[PDB]
Symmetry: D3
């Protein structure tokens, strides 16, 4: 079962788990055949019941120094609320310098849950895309390793340079579910990361990313196409359903969530969520064959990397279960591109 | 000899050394009797000849996960240029949660070398102190672990909470050489960190810190008093002098440096610096006895922690030399307070 | 005397229709109109949002009903407080004894269009309190200046005033703002809610007024309720579900910007989420008992929003079966000068 | 006349209680006036004038009790008193309720009204640039789709007018400036100008026309409207004193858009004398002479005239014009008018 | 013909006259018994017909170096439109340093005619008073000759010092016709300058100034009380009237003028002005006895200095006429206070 | 004819002294004065900073010298460009043919006092170019408006003008700004530097002017130098070291805010750091050869700053031994209308 080596991605949910636990689980995931970690960049969890939000950048240093996994932010908003783009560039450059060939910088337009804390105007999605495109320009200038200046609508950078660089900069991955930003990702950056969705919408995002890259003279067959999915595995279908309902009610909220400020808001909205609202959106089953079929389908659509978030608190059992029953049976095309320098 | 256990601090100079090297050297320093690491928070080095500036926050995660050392920023400016205070609080809380009893948050008013890159008005020292005091208020509110709001002159914080906390928050250490801020440090924070200076000026800072703490009802005898010094050790006096002159000319710049924007500026100013300009200010000698006497004197003034920066590139030889000849012979008072929760 | 309030839902109905229905409601025993101040409806399915201030002039000139905004946010997004004051003063000058100015902290649905920083609820309360101070200064009829955190008013005066200014009614469901309403304003307007929460708001309003030396027994206490009447219980339930899903959203709604957002959230709403929150029944006796209960809690005015599109049938049904059977205490205070 | 008898009545919010204005407009309808121009003020020019109703509420009353056409003359939709998005909603609501009757008159505004919000007051040329941007915003909203806008002066997040008429109301620009007249023809539906000498009126008409042609429109089907101030009374003497006491700003032959307070105008009024009104305000009891004055303007090519009597004798004035003036005015047939 | 020496002030109208002419006329005025010059600080004239506006600060250097007259601005608005208060302080200090005992700094709330050119929000009078009071605080701090900082609502001053100072700073004179600001002038400054007005209103201003000074512990008997008047002298009453009407129509504008932006605006308003509008407000007569009586009356009200602006272009004839017929016959109380260090 | 420029160092000398020395310099063969526009001196030891604009009026009225600012930053810290234009126009109106307006990008030492963001050099160049546009519009003598990135000018006009406006001279050591100076302004002012760098600046200024259709051979090319003359080489060296340590600071100084900062940095400065940068000698022949060399490179004006406090002896010494022996090309252009 597979032309290429066995591999899979593990989603580290900072929303839900203490960072000490996540470190231990990633070390275990490595042992069990996972090859890469996607790590959320939150300040707040969605709900109090999830109850965590570690500073990912400190944690990534620990992961880098204790595993040989690849790893990335999924995703950092470098648009000047929590984080100035110049600093994100330095962080990315430092991590890749220390852990060459292992880091990938995942960026996106952000959500108010996290960015509202600094008490600034929150622009509409389209405008935040414009801010993201400018941030990408800044990160890329800094990645050249020369002294650079920048003056655009949203950011001003005085004479700045990254003195600590890797020989080759880390790839910039854009996390987006928007067709416009997908095109811009292919045009401006190295790879795409998208959440799970129906086939039609995934195929549109891949398509836009590809035509953006070609339009800019790049070869999209050598550019990574990554997906993050939310699943619930447990010992029975019953515990799998309840796990999703209690731990990840935001997974049943089929509506835009980027304007909602507080965990307490999501928690109140969660009172509406029912098991039906998860179909198509979060796979809830104990049947590990069905997990494998779900994942294989995504590979077949043309994703070259998959990052899996189990929503239950049964993270250790989940990692071992996927290691034995799922990861070995996934067929990856050989020499598929992966987020790496 | 000594009433308390043998110990000393190592300064990790991000200005000069690749972060991979610093990690290895800290691991070695642990083996050789150093107990704690002070880590610079820079974006730029002072000169191109120094030639580095890793993102400290990622590096600290690696240090935490691979040593048992105590460690701290020396120092982070949490005043909304590079870093918003809310984020510094999250970073500090995450580090201490992962490495309990090991992290201390060192903060200060910042220098333009690092903060100018975001292209905002750079206030005079006194005003930056006002900004620092407000930032301290924000960090402390977030450290309570409750949902907090803040609205002052410099910062606005919408409903925010740290979900990922240690049982006990890390100490806040203020890095300053100003009598006013020393008093405020004793009043508002947990400990003081100061650079090397003549006895009279050190005794004034200690004195102000103490009376600030008493005025606020605290016991200053249980609050850490920390100093950071720059030395040059090498095989001969000649190499020790040249090491300082080539690697750390800013050490011969007896003047306030916090308004100067570019490495290229310091480098041009360095052309003026001569060996004479270092006396009193950087100890330059191969005589390890004289190193020990210098350090012991500081202990006797009442410092409870010393962090030593060797300015030469001979970091490994320096660590081994101090481990054998210096650290074992330093007499620390027993039950002296140290930066720890 | 027999009376009841009619809620004009600008979210749902063309303003020409609302005018005709208010004229009919007058004929059928309703005495007062509460009129929403929206720019956007909650959902596209509701599909309207007339400019209330123009419409109120038409209502004033063609009926003898009392009427009020429920509610205007005078905090400098859509509307500067100085202008709200002028509008209020003009309406009351033209229709003396008939207008009441209802104000509140606003929702992003309407205010986000001007593209400014949207503060948290508590901060918007601070803005509302400042706006109240501005409106009250202007209502004195003198030349006034104001300089606070949120608003600046250069030398300004209302030359067109009534002999007595219209009452300022605050629309809120928050205990803190209820107390401030009693302390600073003339009366309270609250949405329908369980008895425990209504009794707490009334209580806070009352003790706010007493703390400031006022007599709360002479200050109006107004409630707006959402009901669904139709020919059968079945159509009543479906009417609520299709036309007013926001009534099943028991959670803060003031940060959500777009109708399209509410419409997507509506997919979650179910009939169960309306109990206690929207009365859904064809039994007009049960409508009467529900309303009488609210009178007895101590509300002196009730404004009724039927959520169905069957507005004409609803008005006639209430006129025959409900309004004549409601017992109002004599000399209950009402929003008026 | 080739076309039906008609004339416009100016409702002076500066001077009269809005209840009175409503009654007088109802009377004006009865007497052959066909349209109302309504000032959008916050403050009167002088305390002696002593009023300033909120026009938008009043217009709802007018719409519901008459069959007259009516318009703002003029609203400044440039974000002092009024954000352009709100003006659009107001306009769309009025036309939805009173289809074929409303016209939205806009202009660059005066400090008398806008200074109350305590913001920087730009020079006329800059306020024109703000007006042009406001026009763009109103027109996008009038499309009835969800629209966004980001220009120098205004930001509009996702917004839509759900309550619209089948056809949007015309946008009329009130200006006396050659540049803005051209832009009005290019961008909007019709022109409104104050009284002035023939040469200056002919220049404004000319600029409006060539602006419209340059943009591919037919200016012969676009309204050309003028607002004039007259004083009619029982004798020449009362006509003169009425103007002097009630409308001294009519003798202030100088730009007035920077002056902030009624008390300022009132102090300046002490300078004004009867002589300063010649050319600028017709002051006579001779209704023939009123008719000749108005006919002249029709002949220059104005298709609508709005008349403000400055005296407090509004009822007598309306009846006098109804009997002696309006019936004798010769309007070209099928002349364009501010409407659907 | 007087207890004290013969003296009078000459108003240099920059609105009307080329600065080369004004210099020559002041030199003549010195010869003819005038002792001091008041110099307007305009950017624009009131009307194009007046047709001038020299930069007063350059001109005052020429006056200082070629006469022995006292001189002052009447008045400079130091409120950050045309002029930042720190610069006004430097200008004042430099003039008094070069011409000790001769300069007095006259300040006021400004008019839009001059300040509108920089395109900033123009506040109402009362607010501009608040700005003036803050400016006064800044000028006074700088006048101490120490390194000073300031941070208030309207102005920010970083570490600043006047290195070039006189031994004693020049007096600050406030030009105002407002009872409130008159009181504040006595409380905060050194002297009052007011325009002509009826006796009742002048007596109120003097009275308020005096009680402001006493309330703040100062001695108002040693503080100058100065008035600026506009007169029209010519060979006949007819030319005197026409001179005023054509050259100074703003003198017949009995209304607040501080909001009007353009000369073209005043010029259009001037078409309304008639001879009658000047009574009480500008003395128009060829009878030099009547000029003397007018001026003596003001001395008797309690003014210690009078500055006379002849509105006609007949400046030379006016100076000679006053020198022969008026100045010698004015009775000044001996040792009356005068604007001087 | 014999001529030379005198630099009036406001940083070091009381303005009363500078006036007297300029009057003497006129007597001794100097023809023009360059006057610093400072708020602060470099060091407390220098100890002065008169407001130059007032002083220039005194100079104008008591000498027949030409004079100019060297240089004013008209970029809206200390000085708004509209005001600089008025000042320039007034001076030239009073002293026709004598004033030249020297402008530049400014230093923080002077501009930081108003407590605004201090941009990097390149950005300050952009600000300077916009300021030049403003000054030039005002110099047309018509009513003008301006709206750019950095400045806004409402309807403004200079009513007091000379028949011909004063030349605008840009003080810069940057090749980019030199080209822009030739393109936009009337003349160049540069500090002393090696031949290669001076020849590049002249070259860039020339090709900027040609590109814009001007004749650069009729446009002034001015240089400002710092020298130390005294009775012996020893006193000349010590004078430079004690009075003008900033002359030994071979590094960009435009970001340093305080005199106290420069004073502390001065503790590093040694005699060696002045070679190439400040001529330190008692040999007046060597002074003459230094100056003649600059004339030969193609400078048409030289302004000399003696750094010692021996200003009177210096002026007399140059008058006798230097100025008479300098060979200037006839009909060389000079800063004048
Ligand atoms: Cl993978
Ligand atoms: Cl599907
Ligand atoms: Cl230690
Ligand atoms: Cl010592
Ligand atoms: Cl009711
Ligand atoms: Cl209940
Ligand atoms: Cl008409
Ligand atoms: Cl005098
Ligand atoms: Cl009197
Ligand atoms: Cl020369």
């Amino acid at each position: 079962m597979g032309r290429g080596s066995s591999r899979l991605g593990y989603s580290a949910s900072f929303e839900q788990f203490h960072p000490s636990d996540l470190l231990r689980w990633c070390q275990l995931a490595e042992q069990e055949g996972f090859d890469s970690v996607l790590a959320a960049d939150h300040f707040h969890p969605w709900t109090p019941e999830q109850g965590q939000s570690g500073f990912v950048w400190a944690w990534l240093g620990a992961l880098g120094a204790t595993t040989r996994l690849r790893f990335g932010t999924g995703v950092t908003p470098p648009i000047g609320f929590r984080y100035h783009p110049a600093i994100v560039a330095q962080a990315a450059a430092t991590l890749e310098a220390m852990f060459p060939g292992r880091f990938w910088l995942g960026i996106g337009a952000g959500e108010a849950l996290n960015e509202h804390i600094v008490g600034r105007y929150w622009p509409e999605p389209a405008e935040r895309i414009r801010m993201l495109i400018e941030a990408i320009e800044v990160i890329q200038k800094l990645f050249t390793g020369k002294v650079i200046r920048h003056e655009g609508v949203y950011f001003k950078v005085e004479s700045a340079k990254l003195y600590t660089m890797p020989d080759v900069p880390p790839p910039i991955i854009v996390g987006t579910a928007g067709p416009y930003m997908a095109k811009k990702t292919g045009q401006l950056c190295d790879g795409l990361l998208t959440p799970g969705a129906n086939d039609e919408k995934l195929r549109l995002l891949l398509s836009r990313f590809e035509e953006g890259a070609r339009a800019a003279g790049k070869d999209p067959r050598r550019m990574p196409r990554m997906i993050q999915v939310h699943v619930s595995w447990a010992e029975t279908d019953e515990q799998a359903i309840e796990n999703a309902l209690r731990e990840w009610p935001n997974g049943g909220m089929a509506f835009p969530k980027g304007d909602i400020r507080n965990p307490e808001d999501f928690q109140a909205m969660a009172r509406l969520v029912r098991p039906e609202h998860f179909q198509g959106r979060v796979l809830m089953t104990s049947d590990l064959d069905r997990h494998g079929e779900f994942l294989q389908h995504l590979i077949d659509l043309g994703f070259t990397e998959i990052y899996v978030h189990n929503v239950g608190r049964n993270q250790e059992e989940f990692i071992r279960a996927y290691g034995r029953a799922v990861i070995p049976h996934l067929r990856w095309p050989a020499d598929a591109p992966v987020a790496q320098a």
